[model samples]
Target chain A: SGILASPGIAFGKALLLKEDEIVIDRKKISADQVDQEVERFLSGRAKASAQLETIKTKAGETFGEEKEAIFEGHIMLLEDEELEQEIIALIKDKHMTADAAAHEVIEGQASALEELDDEYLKERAADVRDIGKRLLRNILGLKIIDLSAIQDEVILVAADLTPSETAQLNLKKVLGFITDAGGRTSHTSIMARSLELPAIVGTGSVTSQVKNDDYLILDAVNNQVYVNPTNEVIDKMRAVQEQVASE
Target chain B: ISGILASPGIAFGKALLLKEDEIVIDRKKISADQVDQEVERFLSGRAKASAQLETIKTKAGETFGEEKEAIFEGHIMLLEDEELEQEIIALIKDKHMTADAAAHEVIEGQASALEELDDEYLKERAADVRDIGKRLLRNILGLKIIDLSAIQDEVILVAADLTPSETAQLNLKKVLGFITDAGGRTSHTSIMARSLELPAIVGTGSVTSQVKNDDYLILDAVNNQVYVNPTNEVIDKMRAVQEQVASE
Candidate 1:
């Protein structure tokens, strides 16, 4: 099993990014099932469109017009005749699953827009992607971590942290990091560097092996970690550290 | 399968189906030294791809007495479209991505660029662009396909989607007519059939699943219906029509 991850290393108890992810089942059904397929997409869009509108109204009052513009764009995308016609062609006519068709239509269109010679057109693809994400959220309710508040100081260990979630990391609490994922350029290292936290990343193992408050060491120079290092290994590591100091 | 009547005519025999699903690609990595061999694999794939299409055109010419060969050859001779190959090879060498992924990445950019401002036109042509791209990949992988041109009899063509390039490749002389589970009446395939005066149907949506590979079909394009394994009464009606055609 290949466990994919991101950012700098952290030594902490394992935390799963399990709560917010939705299970997507891709069904390869035939046509004549399209009427229902379009209906599902249509229904999800209505719900998402409504949610966006409601949010936009309250959003303007709270987050101001600038932020409300994002929702307005989302609304415009929901009602986009071009996008709907594109998806309709794939689902009803081409006989693909509702989920597959949306992706087929969106990504194809987005990637096409991404290829445009005109920068004005190319940027719209990201908006299409945002609309896609919002549509999927309405299709299946999803969420993310609440990083605004951390009651205690501890090293954060996770599959990877989202930028928004990472932005909330309290410097006072989150100390010295180790992660099962991330490389030189990963936010784990970049964020770690900015936050001035000593860290090691890409252990490639030990996430499942180590738990909260477990004994650990993140060797930046050697680019390795020790999980409950044996006394002999500890002595050996100390000697290496001593040699480096002398040098 | 059964759908709209792109070209209006009636002829039926066995079924010749060509689908994109038969091509299987394994995502893999190649080291720096191994690069030459991987690129060679890609080149051979193109060679085989060209061989497959050229063979289809040759057969279409041979089967239909050479008059129809020109139509099939026209698609490739359009020439300028052919950048996908160079792009794929560049990617395989430059990025170390597998041939399959390279072709995929290259096609997405090109196909999206090909999308038109008008929704209907874009949807149709966009589909055509992608169909060619996949066929190229399938050829590169040396994916074996049921050669429709190899069929010895006029056969009813069935497919998930049909491209004009595919329509051009068919041995239309023995082939009665064809329909697809997808695409609109305005598709190039539809127009090609109409100009050629063949009875073609499109957009039926369920024929691929309901009809078997060789099941008998009565394509009453005038009525816009396809009766599979027709009853005796239906057979008689078609038989009478066949007789009247001789008198006319």
Candidate 2:
């Protein structure tokens, strides 16, 4: 049994959201290529910064101006003078590739804050790491999941949701959501309530158990989700849903 | 069959088990010649930690009010406590210990003392003290912890326990609710759960072990019970009550 998060009912197919992992392979640059590598790093930073600025504006429109602070922090970290200098130093002095140098500098700063083991610092560290990934994606020409791109009606299955993802997600297309981690006070839970979406969280293995297009019943009112229910159960759920809507 | 109701709400969703990795500290001794360097390392870490806390404090004040921000203010005080610093520095200077090792020993000792206290509220502060110690240790060692913000799940959470710090950091838009193996109604974690209006049940004894990730659940906080893969009869009955509550 789980704890109640929001009270509602929904029935839809599951849309499993699996995020692509960005792997960085360390490579060395030659002495002659140092200046070019530094330029590449600067260019990647600019691209990442511009992307963050667009997201910040979108987030402000969706969640209000104050909530944009998170992206602002990310943009600032992206352009941090010391951080930029350190990454450049890794490229010029250590003869590291632009991607590798950025990883070392970004990961080191992120590791320091994360190691603090405080939740606040951990999240702040996450921002640092996320910006790091952004830079990498831009430099490497990689693609990642964008929730706003979805066009189908389905319940989203994931491990956890960040504030950035929540802000950018296509809410109208989402029938509801099920996740593996989070509690009632988590950012996702509060959003579920605000949006009146049938949501269940902290289920340790929903993503693994559910596949794409799996028929699911998200009964937030009764606190039960039926996956691939028998015909009889589906009929029962339909009747119950009707009664709930009537009430 | 029942757990202490932390907040009043009803939600039905799949279960998601939350497994956290523990931080490991190295306790190796340091050379006497490196004592000054180790001490300087601690101070720099301390300043950096304090700066992070100030940002947190400001954000908390804007979002949660003065009372919530005060918690971080208290944390900063503990981080900057001269007495604690002196004890840590003494451990480094007199015993020739690594900064992280010394901080861990001292912080754990202090936390244990607070945990042994008779007062419930004071005992809870032990978590806060350990939290500070962890900050110092991580900063000094440059170790990394897990980044939870990268995830996006919306299911009922099952956990062994949650500290106030952990609870405060949760993604509010993603988590539906949480059930834990330990906590009391009067605990600060419970208080915050209610404040955030998330459904929670504490002191489940073995819920974390029994529940797997993605298990279907019916969380009936109003009745102080949760049903695991309940039969259709139970689901129907719960829905009736839900409809009744809604109409009322």
Candidate 3:
């Protein structure tokens, strides 16, 4: 059954569940969606690489052996063949968006090694997450998505976002947002302004939650939702809308 | 009496303090054992400093402001370089010297790269590197004059002007009190001690010399008395002051 239309899901099963499980399988999504994720990843990686290279070159030109040696390490990260190979493989084989592909590969690599049980190896998780997110944004062909985009009243949805990305979000437009994955600082909770819209993140299997143009009420501040809300809920939403408009 | 007890007056009093701990006048030259011990101490100190540098690098990367983060990383790389480590090790083996002597020699020899630099900033950075190298050498040789690890759980530290490096090395978690023999209230150690919430008394000369190792010392700063081997009554007064500070 098609769900009624609403601005944000503040009540009712806010998350899109698949067979009682949170499905993150990008393979089920449309080609366009996959492409979008891939592009974002690639673009972010390009920027990160460029910045690292510039720093390396500058340090090399101005400094002696010690400084030169320091910059060399950064250069190595820029030219890491393993990362490049993973990104290229995802693009060539999966026909995924650059951002999606980068995220997939980076996440996969990071998850694979997270259970090493060694302190040194465990710390590599932060590095993996950093590189993955950066590459994912690059692949999406987005310049650290201007947080200003959220300045208008709108609902936002994404797979995941970082703390910095969340910080940049314009609170004015961001009435409410949902994500397939994320924790406290996962780009949602960190940027709670006065509006504090009904938002949810880490909602596993969010793709099945609603069809296009579904009526929803998102209570982001309290992390609640109302899917296919009744007239009573609609009236409450209207009152909220009026209150927000008045303010 | 105070005037009579000054440096010149004390010099004539049979040098009582020096005489007490003075070695028999054998007039023997330094032996090989002394040299070996000193070198070993120097190398151990270098290794310890190297470990600390690694820790600082990690910390700098995590929280250092943008400008200083990269610079700290550069310092770490220099410290960890295989070539530098090899050079120091080779010197140690060649001279049959302690790690401290070996590290010092390598630093003195290879530090020319920094000396030759024309830029003031680069030159300053070079000096920093050299200083760290020297410190590491000293640590390895067991030449550290102030042993921070030996600090007691509850006692006042009395010193004659702690250096910035020494101050940095102090673990505030273990140090309950602070006192310096050669500093005013504005001294680096005094300021640091205050920040760490440790009670401090400063500018009391010869405190380090007066207090013996492991002596139950009490810093009655409020009363302006450095009570040595204080009775329970003296400790009670100090505790009362500590309580008042905590309550406020």
Q: Identify the candidate with maximal TM-score.
A: 2
Using Cα atoms, each model's DockQ against the true complex is: 0.00, 0.02, 0.00
Q: State the lDDT at B92 in candidate 3.
A: 50
Poorly placed runs, candidate 3 (over 4 Å): A1-247, B1-48, B55-102, B105-131, B139-152, B160-171, B182-187, B223-225, B232-238, B241-248
Write the residue-wise lDDT of candidate 1 on A1-247 in tens digits.
Answer: 1111112233343232333544443776676687887887888788778766666655465446865776687688677899888877877666766666777666776788878687557547756775666566555545533444566556665655433245345566775566666434455666666565656555555557667666555444323456667867667555544243342
Cα lDDT computed for each candidate against the true fold? 0.61, 0.75, 0.49
* B121-150 per-residue lDDT for model 2 (tens digits): 767788789877776677777655333333
lDDT of 3 at B212: 64
Report the TM-score of candidate 2, chain A only.
0.87
Between prediction 1 and prediction 2, the one with superior lDDT is: 2
Winner by DockQ between candidate 3 and candidate 2: 2
**Per-prediction TM-score, chain B alone:** 0.77, 0.77, 0.50
Write the candidate numbers in order of decreasing TM-score. 2, 1, 3
Model 2, position A213: C-alpha lDDT score:
87
Worst 10 residues of 1 chain B by lDDT: B239-248
lDDT of 2: 0.75
lDDT of 2 by residue, A1-247 (tens): 3334566667788888876677775778789999987888888887878877777877888878787887888888889999888989988888988888889988999999987779888878777787788898877667755577877888887888877677678888898778886656566677787788877776768888888889988766545678899978888667644355543
TM-score of 2: 0.50
Best candidate according to DockQ? 2
| Model 2: lDDT of residue A60 | 84
Candidate 3 lDDT, B1-248, residue by residue in tens? 00000000000000011111211211223345565554455445556776665555454445433444466556657766688777766555555545555566666666667778698666656666765665565455344434454444544455555544444445555655655554344455555655555555555666666666566765543223456666777567555632333232
> What digit string (tens of lDDT, one per residue) describes model 1 on residues B1-248?
33544564566555655555565665677677767776787777666656666776676676554666775464454222456667777778888878777776776666687674667666655665666567667876766655555668777776666665566556667667777776645666666666667777677776777777777777655434577888888777665643233242
TM-score of each: 0.43, 0.50, 0.30
